[PDB]
C-alpha cells in the first residue's frame, strides 16, 4: 500500500519490536559472532563517500541480529519483510550519521555493554524514522 | 514443516516477542478496551464449564487483542499470517483449564494497574503453553 508517514512509522515499530528483542535476547552470541568484526571493518573502511557499502553494511548488521536468535520463522518473517524495509531506507539521506550510529553500537555491543546498545539501537531507529518521514514531505 | 519440539519452541518464542512487545506498549489501551470485558466474562464462563470450544475463542480473542491494540498493520498481518501455526501448537495444551485460569490473572493484573506482573504473566503463560505442548507431543 501507499508509502505514507504511517507506513514508514509501522515499518519502524516492527523493526524495533524484532531486532531489540533479538539483541536483547542472543547478546552474547551477536557480541562474539565472527560476522559482526567483519561487519565492524565494513563501517571503519567506508569513507563518507564509499552508498552501495553503507545500504549492505546496514542490512548485514540488522539481519546478524535476527539471525542470531537461530529462530527460523523469526528469522523468515524479517525476510518477509525486508523489502519494505529496504523501501523506507531509501529515503534515509543520512546515512552517513547512520553509520556512524552503528559503530557505537557494535562498540557498545563488543565492550559489554548491553543495555547501552538496545537504548543505541532504538535511537537508531527513530532517528531513521525521523529523517525518513522529513525527506518524504518534500516530495 | 514439521511440528517437532524446535517448531513449538519457536512458535512461541514468536509469541512472546510480539505480545510482549504489544502489551509493554500499548498497555493503557489495552486495559481500557471493552473487549477485554467482554472477554473477562468468556473466561468466568469456561472456569464454570470446561468446554473447549469456548477456551479456544477466548484465548484467540485476549492474544489477539494485544496484537491489534498497537494499531500496527503489519504487527497485526504477521500475527495473522502466523496464527494457524500458533493454532495448531494450542491443539497439544491439554490442561487448558489452567490456561483459562492464568488468563483469568493476567486480565486482572491489567485492569488493576499492574504493567510488570502483567507482563511477567503472560510470559509465564507462553513458558507454560510451551512446556505442556511439548510434554504432550512427547508421549504419541
Known sequence: ???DEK????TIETRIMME???????????????E???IKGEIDDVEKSAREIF???????????????????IISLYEKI?????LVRHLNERYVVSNREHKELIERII???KEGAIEKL?????????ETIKNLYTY
Do not use: Q
Not at 507506513?7 to 509501522?10: G, H, L, P, V
Open 7 to 10: 507506513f514508514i512509522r509501522e
Open 82 to 86: 525486508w523489502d519494505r524495509i529496504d
Open 55 to 73: 545500504d549492505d553494511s546496514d542490512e548485514r548488521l540488522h539481519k546478524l541480529f535476527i539471525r542470531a536468535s537461530g529462530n527460523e520463522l
Open 122 to 130: 532504538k535511537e537508531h531507529l527513530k532517528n531513521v524514522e525521523a
Open 111 to 113: 565492550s559489554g555493554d
Open 20 to 34: 531489540v528483542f533479538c539483541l536483547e535476547n542472543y547478546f552474547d552470541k551477536i557480541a562474539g559472532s565472527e
Open 36 to 38: 559482526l568484526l567483519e
Open 1 to 3: 500500500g501507499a508509502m
